[PDB]
Amino acid sequence: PAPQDPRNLPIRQQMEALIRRKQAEITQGLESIDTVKFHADTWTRGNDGGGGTSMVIQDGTTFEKGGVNVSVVYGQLSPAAVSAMKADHKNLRLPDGVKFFACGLSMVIHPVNPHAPTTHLNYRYFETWNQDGTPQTWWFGGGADLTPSYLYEEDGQLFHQLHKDALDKHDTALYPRFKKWCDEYFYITHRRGIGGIFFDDYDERDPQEILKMVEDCFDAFLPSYLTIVKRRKDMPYTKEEQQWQAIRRGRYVEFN
Amino acid sequence: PAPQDPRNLPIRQQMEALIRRKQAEITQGLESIDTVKFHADTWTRGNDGGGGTSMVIQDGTTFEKGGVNVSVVYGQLSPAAVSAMKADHKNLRLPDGVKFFACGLSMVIHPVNPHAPTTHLNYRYFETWNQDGTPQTWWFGGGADLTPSYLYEEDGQLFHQLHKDALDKHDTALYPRFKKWCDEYFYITHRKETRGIGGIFFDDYDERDPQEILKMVEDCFDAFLPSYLTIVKRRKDMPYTKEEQQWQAIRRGRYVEFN
């Protein structure tokens, strides 16, 4: 192939290259345990948006519906837009519109078998520009998680372990903080789920290092998800169970 | 129209009637502030499932993508099937499979304007049957929430307020319990995270007479349009650039959510 991997190019270029590479790696990986392939989403819209491509999988023997998208955007933030984003971004300062760049990969996969879990993954980068085009205010965001129909603790444990290992390669203080905590909190305070990791407005380290952190996080996905799906996709289940799980999670409207 | 309402028919029939009525009410309500109409989801996939219909809206001037579905299912839960669900159902017991019925409405709406929020709503009912066909083990589940792109605290407050009002008509102790707004607990660990709106959620709920819970569900349904249409109307015409919309799609993974 041809993905770039040095350290000299602007973060925006390295990040776009990274997500385009992972989109191909992930679709290929998922296809390795199914019987169908992903295909470009050439749906008729008016303003489809995005800059990259949208890959969709459907009616497979393992994955009923899924999509992996890469989007890149160049634009400007008006004073009003900045004002609406300010509270979630510690360094976003209005100082007349300001140019920005953003890109990210987003995906959602829904297995056919209720014993296998749905997964969501998203890694993105955002930066406003200085007059000279260099990054002014920037941050990374993203993470990944599992939403089970039938819950298997071992699966949640493996998913978390590999993402923890990814984050530990940079700072062991990251995983405990990035671990999704809310649902678990409500579960305890009240008399269940899997979750995963999530971070946003993350600009606390050298961006070149966060780039690598994101790459390592991406790399915790296939080893955990493929392993999990392999051990659940061929488990027995009745049409009734599948139908109830669909009602419980409203899957029909999720992919329509 | 033709929906039923008396507390004489079995809960399963009353609930199915309720969700079908609300599916029509909700799609009409949403269409009232858009220029396009919902249409049937006639896709040739592996399994359609459900016993009702899947209404979908797309490329509207107000709503970009959205769906409202009603599904109904009958069948027998094998001993192994029943055993795989007991984990989170206080009264679901082992006792040759047992017949069951379940139904529910689910929906997700994505507005075009990033100043307007995405919403998810789901209300359902499940019951196993006795030999004479009456309910043995049963429960209701549900919830509704908002997922903002651009965040407006006033909108989250209205959404929560109307759902609180609906629950208060039954027991003021319910809302504080069903409420799920993570932001409220950021303080415990000085957590600095992205703001959200949350909503209300409940499951395996069988704590009161089913006829009363059915009414509770109807009241919760009726908190939706008054809050959501009000919110969308005050945000759908706010200025925004194509790029702003694209960024919000990148942080929320919209394109894939559409599928």
UniProtKB/Swiss-Prot annotation, chain B:
Pathway: Porphyrin-containing compound metabolism; protoporphyrin-IX biosynthesis; protoporphyrinogen-IX from coproporphyrinogen-III (O2 route): step 1/1
EC numbers on record: 1.3.3.3
The keyword Cytoplasm appears for this protein: yes
One GO CC annotation: cytosol
Entry superkingdom: Eukaryota
Region forming the signal peptide: none
Record-marked site positions (Important for dimerization): 190
Top EC class for this record: oxidoreductase
BP GO terms, sorted: heme biosynthetic process; protoporphyrinogen IX biosynthetic process
Transmembrane segments: none
GO MF annotation: an example: coproporphyrinogen oxidase activity
Keywords from the named record: Cytoplasm, Disulfide bond, Heme biosynthesis, Oxidoreductase, Porphyrin biosynthesis
Region (Important for dimerization) residue spans: 56-65
Chemical reaction(s) catalysed: coproporphyrinogen III + O2 + 2 H(+) = protoporphyrinogen IX + 2 CO2 + 2 H2O
Residues that hold substrate according to the record: 106, 122-124
Location within or outside the cell: Cytoplasm
pH dependence: Optimum pH is 7.6.
Other observations noted: Present with 22000 molecules/cell in log phase SD medium.
Assembly: Homodimer.
Family that this chain belongs to: Belongs to the aerobic coproporphyrinogen-III oxidase family.
Protein name: Oxygen-dependent coproporphyrinogen-III oxidase
Organism in which the protein naturally occurs: Saccharomyces cerevisiae (strain ATCC 204508 / S288c)
